[PDB]
Structure 1
Amino acid sequence: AHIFVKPELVAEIGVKQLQREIVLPGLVWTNPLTDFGGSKNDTITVRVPAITTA
Structure 2
Amino acid sequence: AHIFVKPELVAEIGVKQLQREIVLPGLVWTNPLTDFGGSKNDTITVRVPAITTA
TM-score, L = length of structure 2: 0.80
Question: Number of residues paired by the alignment?
Answer: 54
Work out the CA distance in 1 between the residues paired with 2:4 and 2:24: 55
After superposition, residues 1-54 of structure 1 pair within 5 angstroms as 1-52=1-52
Q: Which runs of 5+ in 2 are unaligned?
A: none
Q: CA deviation at 1:20?
A: 1.0
Q: Which runs of 5+ in 1 are unaligned?
A: none
Q: What value does the CA root-mean-square deviation take over the aligned residues?
A: 1.6
SS in 1 for 2:45: coil
Q: CA deviation at 1:36?
A: 0.7
Write the deviation string for residues 2-52 of structure 1: whole angstroms up to 9, x where unpaired.
332211000011110011111110000000001111111111011122345
TM-score, L = length of structure 1: 0.80
Quick one: percent identity of the two aligned structures?
A: 100
Higher strand share: 2
